[PDB]
Design an enzyme around this catalytic site. Structure first.
Site, PDB file in Angstrom:
ATOM      1  N   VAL A  25       0.859  -1.176   0.000  1.00 15.55           N
ATOM      2  CA  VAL A  25       0.000   0.000   0.000  1.00 15.55           C
ATOM      3  C   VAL A  25       0.899   1.231   0.000  1.00 15.55           C
ATOM      4  O   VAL A  25       1.793   1.352   0.840  1.00 15.55           O
ATOM      5  CB  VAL A  25      -0.969   0.011   1.218  1.00 15.55           C
ATOM      6  CG1 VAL A  25      -1.787   1.292   1.258  1.00 15.55           C
ATOM      7  CG2 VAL A  25      -1.896  -1.202   1.185  1.00 15.55           C
ATOM      8  N   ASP A 130     -17.476  -6.411   7.966  1.00 19.46           N
ATOM      9  CA  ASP A 130     -16.382  -6.046   8.865  1.00 19.46           C
ATOM     10  C   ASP A 130     -16.308  -4.534   9.119  1.00 19.46           C
ATOM     11  O   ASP A 130     -15.244  -3.913   9.038  1.00 19.46           O
ATOM     12  CB  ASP A 130     -15.044  -6.586   8.343  1.00 19.46           C
ATOM     13  CG  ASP A 130     -13.939  -6.505   9.378  1.00 19.46           C
ATOM     14  OD1 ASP A 130     -14.250  -6.508  10.590  1.00 19.46           O
ATOM     15  OD2 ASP A 130     -12.756  -6.428   8.979  1.00 19.46           O
TER      16      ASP A 130
HETATM   17  C1  LIG Z   1      -0.068   1.230  13.409  1.00 17.78           C
HETATM   18  N1  LIG Z   1      -0.537   1.377  12.018  1.00 17.78           N
HETATM   19  C2  LIG Z   1       0.543   1.009  11.078  1.00 17.78           C
HETATM   20  C3  LIG Z   1       0.084   1.193   9.621  1.00 17.78           C
HETATM   21  N2  LIG Z   1      -1.356   1.545   9.537  1.00 17.78           N
HETATM   22  C4  LIG Z   1      -1.838   1.391   8.149  1.00 17.78           C
HETATM   23  C5  LIG Z   1      -1.204   2.401   7.181  1.00 17.78           C
HETATM   24  C6  LIG Z   1      -2.191   2.745   6.061  1.00 17.78           C
HETATM   25  O1  LIG Z   1      -2.749   1.846   5.439  1.00 17.78           O
HETATM   26  N3  LIG Z   1      -2.361   4.056   5.833  1.00 17.78           N
HETATM   27  C7  LIG Z   1      -3.196   4.611   4.930  1.00 17.78           C
HETATM   28  C8  LIG Z   1      -3.258   6.005   4.900  1.00 17.78           C
HETATM   29  C9  LIG Z   1      -4.115   6.653   4.018  1.00 17.78           C
HETATM   30  C10 LIG Z   1      -4.925   5.916   3.162  1.00 17.78           C
HETATM   31  N4  LIG Z   1      -5.749   6.554   2.315  1.00 17.78           N
HETATM   32  C11 LIG Z   1      -6.533   5.872   1.494  1.00 17.78           C
HETATM   33  N5  LIG Z   1      -6.528   4.547   1.476  1.00 17.78           N
HETATM   34  C12 LIG Z   1      -5.733   3.832   2.300  1.00 17.78           C
HETATM   35  N6  LIG Z   1      -5.755   2.496   2.264  1.00 17.78           N
HETATM   36  C13 LIG Z   1      -6.739   1.775   1.694  1.00 17.78           C
HETATM   37  C14 LIG Z   1      -6.687   1.454   0.336  1.00 17.78           C
HETATM   38  C15 LIG Z   1      -7.710   0.695  -0.251  1.00 17.78           C
HETATM   39  C16 LIG Z   1      -8.808   0.248   0.494  1.00 17.78           C
HETATM   40  N7  LIG Z   1      -9.758  -0.510  -0.104  1.00 17.78           N
HETATM   41  C17 LIG Z   1     -11.067  -0.573   0.189  1.00 17.78           C
HETATM   42  O2  LIG Z   1     -11.582   0.109   1.075  1.00 17.78           O
HETATM   43  N8  LIG Z   1     -11.786  -1.438  -0.545  1.00 17.78           N
HETATM   44  C18 LIG Z   1     -13.116  -1.657  -0.407  1.00 17.78           C
HETATM   45  C19 LIG Z   1     -14.055  -0.752  -0.100  1.00 17.78           C
HETATM   46  C20 LIG Z   1     -15.199  -1.439  -0.078  1.00 17.78           C
HETATM   47  C21 LIG Z   1     -16.632  -0.921   0.220  1.00 17.78           C
HETATM   48  C22 LIG Z   1     -17.160  -0.079  -0.939  1.00 17.78           C
HETATM   49  C23 LIG Z   1     -16.654  -0.066   1.491  1.00 17.78           C
HETATM   50  C24 LIG Z   1     -17.542  -2.137   0.424  1.00 17.78           C
HETATM   51  N9  LIG Z   1     -14.941  -2.707  -0.362  1.00 17.78           N
HETATM   52  N10 LIG Z   1     -13.730  -2.839  -0.554  1.00 17.78           N
HETATM   53  C25 LIG Z   1     -13.215  -4.040  -0.867  1.00 17.78           C
HETATM   54  C26 LIG Z   1     -13.911  -4.822  -1.796  1.00 17.78           C
HETATM   55  C27 LIG Z   1     -13.451  -6.085  -2.154  1.00 17.78           C
HETATM   56  C28 LIG Z   1     -12.284  -6.581  -1.578  1.00 17.78           C
HETATM   57  C29 LIG Z   1     -11.587  -5.820  -0.647  1.00 17.78           C
HETATM   58  N11 LIG Z   1     -10.474  -6.322  -0.109  1.00 17.78           N
HETATM   59  C30 LIG Z   1     -12.051  -4.548  -0.285  1.00 17.78           C
HETATM   60  C31 LIG Z   1      -8.841   0.557   1.862  1.00 17.78           C
HETATM   61  C32 LIG Z   1      -7.824   1.318   2.454  1.00 17.78           C
HETATM   62  C33 LIG Z   1      -4.888   4.520   3.179  1.00 17.78           C
HETATM   63  C34 LIG Z   1      -4.025   3.870   4.067  1.00 17.78           C
HETATM   64  C35 LIG Z   1      -2.199   0.627  10.340  1.00 17.78           C
HETATM   65  C36 LIG Z   1      -1.730   0.530  11.807  1.00 17.78           C
END
Ligand SMILES: CN1CCN(CCC(=O)Nc2ccc3ncnc(Nc4ccc(NC(=O)Nc5cc(C(C)(C)C)nn5-c5cccc(N)c5)cc4)c3c2)CC1
EC number: 2.7.10.2
Length: 261
Positions: A25, A130
């Site tokens: 990511v 979730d």
């Molecule tokens: C101590 N810390 C240490 C490090 N930290 C983490 C660091 C970090 O990660 N930062 C960060 C910062 C800014 C970020 N900004 C943006 N995105 C990030 N990430 C991001 C990218 C993509 C998505 N995808 C979706 O949400 N998909 C999705 C939506 C939906 C619906 C429509 C809701 C149903 N369904 N699906 C979906 C469908 C099918 C399969 C799947 N798997 C999913 C989510 C999040 C970011 C992330 C944690 C703890």
């Protein structure tokens, strides 16, 4: 082959945000100006078609309070491009340096936003499965969006869902109730001190988390409505949205700011 495709030179991957089992990511830049989140597929780890289902779902579900898909690169090595939320997940936000400054008016407003996002999911007949603070993204001006990091969580899961696989929008409502305790405790794990096996049983006997310190009783009562034994007796997200938006006029007009809430 679709209107979502972008050249590979369009993406600059700037800062690594996390590594998974199937890829990475990244924070980055799309077209030199648009701040962007970039999800990587490590070839061989997962079917290209499997990884790209995430984008397919995000094309069908569009709303101001759902994470926004921007673009894809659908040929290996694959890249999924979504909007960058500058504060990260709600859990980290609540636990971090910003924790202490948030009070009930802010926390309820964030809840109203999530509820709104979930009200859209409700209208679409989708199920999240979730919903919790770790799956909510926060941006500027306390903007919250429903998301899914895809990365069990029985503490957030409705009993019928955990036990019998009955995942519905009403098991999502249960989870929203638990989300409310995360908001009101500044990100603490629910059922403190209880292990997974202690939660499942005690919930079936009827144990519910008590009103958090400084939380108005009317809000805990709202959690309890989300936590009703009977899925069909739980309130709709449409209801949750409206209640939360109107909270400080209709429900708690005498609210006085305290130490933490
Ligand atoms: C101590 N810390 C240490 C490090 N930290 C983490 C660091 C970090 O990660 N930062 C960060 C910062 C800014 C970020 N900004 C943006 N995105 C990030 N990430 C991001 C990218 C993509 C998505 N995808 C979706 O949400 N998909 C999705 C939506 C939906 C619906 C429509 C809701 C149903 N369904 N699906 C979906 C469908 C099918 C399969 C799947 N798997 C999913 C989510 C999040 C970011 C992330 C944690 C703890």
């Amino acid at each position: 082959k679709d209107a979502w495709e972008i050249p590979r030179e369009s993406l600059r991957l700037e800062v690594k945000l996390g590594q998974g089992c199937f890829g990475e990511v990244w924070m980055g830049t799309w077209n030199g100006t648009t701040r962007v989140a970039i999800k990587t597929l490590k070839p061989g780890t997962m079917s290209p078609e499997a990884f790209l289902q995430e984008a397919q779902v995000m094309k069908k579900l569009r709303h101001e309070k759902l994470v926004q898909l921007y673009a894809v690169v659908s040929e290996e090595p694959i890249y999924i491009v979504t909007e960058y939320m500058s504060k990260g997940c709600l859990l980290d936000f609540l636990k971090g340096e910003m924790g202490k400054y948030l009070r009930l008016p802010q926390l309820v407003d964030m809840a109203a936003q999530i509820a709104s996002g979930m009200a859209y999911v409700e209208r679409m007949n989708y199920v999240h499965r979730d919903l919790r603070a770790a799956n909510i993204l926060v941006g500027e001006n306390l903007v919250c969006k429903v998301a899914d990091f895809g990365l069990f969580p029985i503490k957030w899961t409705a009993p019928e869902a955990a036990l019998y696989g009955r995942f519905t929008i009403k098991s999502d409502v249960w989870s929203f109730g638990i989300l409310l305790t995360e908001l009101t405790t500044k990100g603490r794990v629910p059922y403190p001190g209880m292990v997974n096996r202690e939660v499942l049983d005690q919930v079936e006997r009827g144990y519910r988390m008590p009103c958090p310190p400084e939380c108005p009783e009317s809000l805990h009562d709202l959690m309890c409505q989300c936590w009703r034994k009977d899925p069909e007796e739980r309130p709709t997200f449409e209801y949750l949205q409206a209640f939360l938006e109107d909270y400080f006029t209709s429900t708690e007009p005498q609210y006085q700011p305290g130490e933490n809430l």
